[PDB]
Amino acid sequence: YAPGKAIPGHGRATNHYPELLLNNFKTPLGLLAAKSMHILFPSKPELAGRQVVTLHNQRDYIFFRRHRYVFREARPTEKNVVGADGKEMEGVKGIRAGLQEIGPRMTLKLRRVDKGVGRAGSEGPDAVKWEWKAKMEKKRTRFNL
Amino acid sequence: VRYAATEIAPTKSARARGSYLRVSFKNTRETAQAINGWKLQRALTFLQNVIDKKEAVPMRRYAGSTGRTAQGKQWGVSRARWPVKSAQFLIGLLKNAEANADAKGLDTGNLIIKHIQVNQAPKQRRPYMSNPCHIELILTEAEETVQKSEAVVR
Amino acid sequence: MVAAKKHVPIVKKRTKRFMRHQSDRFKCLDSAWRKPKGIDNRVRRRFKGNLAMPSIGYGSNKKTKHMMPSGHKAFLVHNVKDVELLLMHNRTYAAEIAHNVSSRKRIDIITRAKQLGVKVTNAKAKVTTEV
RNA sequence: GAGACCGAUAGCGCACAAGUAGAGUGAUCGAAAGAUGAAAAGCACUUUGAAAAGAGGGUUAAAUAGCACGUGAAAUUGUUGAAAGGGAAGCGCUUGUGACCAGACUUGCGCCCGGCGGAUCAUCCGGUGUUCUCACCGGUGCACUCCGCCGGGCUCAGGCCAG
RNA sequence: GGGACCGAGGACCGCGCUCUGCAAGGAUGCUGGCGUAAUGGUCACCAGCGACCCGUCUUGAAACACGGACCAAGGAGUCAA
RNA sequence: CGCGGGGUUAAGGUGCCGGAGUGGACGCUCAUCAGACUGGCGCUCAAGCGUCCCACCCAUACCCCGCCCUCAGGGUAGAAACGAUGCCCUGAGGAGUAGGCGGCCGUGGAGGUCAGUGACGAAGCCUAGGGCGUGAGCCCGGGUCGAACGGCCUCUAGUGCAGAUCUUGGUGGUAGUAGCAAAUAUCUAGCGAAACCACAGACCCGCACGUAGACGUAUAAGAAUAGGCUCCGGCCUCGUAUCCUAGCAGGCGAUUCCUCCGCCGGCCUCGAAGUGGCCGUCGGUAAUUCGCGUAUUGCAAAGACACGCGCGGGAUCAAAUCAGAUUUC
RNA sequence: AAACUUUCAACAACGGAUCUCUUGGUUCUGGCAUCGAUGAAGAACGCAGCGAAAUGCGAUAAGUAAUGUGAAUUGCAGAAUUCCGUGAAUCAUCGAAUCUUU
């Protein structure tokens, strides 16, 4: 956890509703986590204030960042943005997004999913929906998302 | 509590290292201190104009009275010297960091030398002792500024 | 009402440490006190403006010796049986879990000590709260 | 075959290339030097370049364990941040300023009603072990007594500092 | 009459008195304040006062002299009769 | 001469440095380097000298209280409300080289024990963290780390370092200096020691923050001190004076006054190190009298806006240093 | 202003202390008695695919024979070499041999 002040060259957020970039959620547990993060925010973002909240899942670690952006023309020494699995993003060649951090940098890792409000509040045999154990990360290529 | 100033993103920086390099530690340290904080192309031109003789390197801490010319007027130091080999090693590490930034996907026209550190390497056991060094430089991109949007009313 | 006992106010005659003479100048000299043995050593002769030496007049009151600012005395515990020895001395002693005690044994000690009414100085050790 | 021995500046000069490397015409003199990881799985491949070198990337539980390898002190050095100074610095006592850190008593008991459930309650029954008169089980029920739990009501006791 | 500093002890016992209880073998009573901080600590700096460089040796005493670039490890009243 | 708090003194002092009297009575002394119960500044009806009187300042000294230790005296069993090697009461004392005695801390290993800690993390190390002890030291937190370790009662010793022109290893200033020398006549590349060493001689984007001592911090000739002021009546030891001083940290509406203050323009004034007067505009204005609100802050101890000082980049003028590079409000 | 000097903190160096380990040393105790003209101790030169060191061996040269065990050796390369066999092995035992120059 680092507050916005700690980040060098940072900004102050406004009251606009941000837009969500929930990236790389494939597992049903990951879909549940993505939906749980999605319901916390309003569905319609105020696009006048270009503010983006990013929750990017990589190898079970959810990196949370918050930026403000601007769609600018590329400086003539910048390269065109490379697309995923194939270069030359079609349509935005020469157009690039400038980003400035306005929010905290944090890292999350889903540890437990419970039916009710914590362990005291979940009652039946379906009390805990999911529990993280270290033995599930015994292999470095096994991810729960 | 107090939170330390977090590091810049690894997608916005490029690091180069050189270890157990056979150049003098003091001259390399002074050369690295001269180019510290500059833009990348300016440092390229300065080191290439100190490899072939036009421009001077001032010495402040490890300063030996060798030359006193007008080339130290721009630095305010009356003692100025021209190390050559340290310039070649710094040039090699600078193009190494340029290749690293090009491979990573950074704009190479807005690269600035965030930090350059010269540490002492183990001494060469041959009473005459050699003084090798380690060099660790980190280039970053120029800080980008985004214009805000006006707040909405409620 | 649960605190330490009623005790006389804790008075420390000196809060600073007695540093060894010339130990701030030499890195080979630790700051632990060594009595100067030289004849002309002005610390030993007690000249004005020099270091004081430790004396028995600096001693603490016997009713508040070994006592923490809370009023309890520290009692080092390594297991649950050790905190059980403070059943009848909950107001005079506080539990200090040893540095080499594992996390689960620390949880056992903290839980029992709370039930016995014994304060734990290092209860914020390698444990955390789960809801 | 052993030891109240020594544990890599120790113990034989020598835990390892040790009477070796090396010195002296010769007789002779004579070192320093142990530890990756459980397993080499000892870093493929892409990309700088001429390096006993890097950046990505990979193996591994871990590579800030990469044959400079367990841990990794101090002297001494570099980068960043803060403060002070230019006719010495350093120390003792006492406030102040700035920054950082901690977090004070661990904060309780007793009475009065109503409901519920257990018992050491029932001169209830049966069983077990005993120090043979004390404990422990199983089954009955709430007339009395005693414990708890829940909902209300009240009183009291509480750590430190000022006037 | 005004002011300062202090409150050691911890059931009763004693000497007493102005004796329904008291100023008589050591402070209680009332009110207020205290947890996004009462109160501490560490580092750096400034400020007021103070302060000859350590060990050894000689001399009535000084004064000279000797040793001290720094750090780590080793390092000297032992064992027998 | 234990560690503290308060009070009072000794010797010595009370012009400043310097805490405390420019204290009081009586005389003397002007010295072209007086004199000081002077150190410097400095002092002359003293801050010098002689006597006398009063008040004041502060030592680890004296007195009262608290606390530590030591010594001494007393009490304690058909046992105690604490290991009789324990506890309780009382009094006095506290410098210290060579030297003597006692207690206690720490290190390696051994026997016993803690049914001790530990891969859910031992030992070690680092640490602008928290405690305990007079102290040697000990305990805990945070980080690193990866296989052993600790307390207690006894036993045992190759058991505690600041120094020995100490041993071994590592690392410095000198110093990128002297010099290019064995090994590996100047300037500039590359290489590179040794002696010695206790310490020293105007805009555009983004970001950030708001007093060596104010509380009425008001007051202008000079000149003399065997005289000055003045209204020409007179006045003077006395600045123990003059102005100003009311309202929610100071509101509203009146009644009522043209009195005061403040801001801007005109007329002039101020140079010595720069300012005030007059007029005019506007705003406030208890000299007098009221109706409203001031409370539970309960007996003294984090919102918005505006204005500034700054930065990190961009280009805007005017210049400087070395058309083209850097820098400056 | 900037530069330099000093102190503190984080990180990165230098260096190899501390901790833990140990196919080593050291001291004690017990059984036993065995070098050489049938050529000893010692010195030298050679022998392997890659052998730098160490070790083993001697032109039968990292060894031959005999016995025993029973399926390897091993860093890389090679074997049509051996697996119900008188038979692998950088194996052990060891009574037969070979044993260059000194």
Side-chain angles (χ1 to χ4, degrees), chain C residues 63-82:
Chain C
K63 316 174 139 222
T64 56
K65 204 161 172 231
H66 304 299
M67 257 175 50
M68 283 164 14
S70 90
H72 308 88
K73 273 140 115 190
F75 190 77
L76 194 68
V77 293
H78 291 254
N79 45 64
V80 188
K81 302 114 62 180
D82 297 354

Side-chain angles (χ1 to χ4, degrees), chain B residues 72-122:
Chain B
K73 284 196 62 173
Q74 42 188 350
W75 326 109
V77 192
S78 296
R79 306 155 102 173
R81 221 195 98 83
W82 328 274
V84 160
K85 282 268 295 320
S86 314
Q88 330 213 15
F89 276 67
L90 258 68
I91 276 279
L93 275 197
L94 251 62
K95 336 309 307 293
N96 195 203
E98 238 197 335
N100 296 347
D102 195 15
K104 187 169 311 306
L106 273 67
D107 174 38
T108 67
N110 282 21
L111 289 186
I112 55 198
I113 317 188
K114 175 193 184 176
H115 113 94
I116 177 163
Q117 174 179 306
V118 185
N119 269 356
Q120 308 206 52

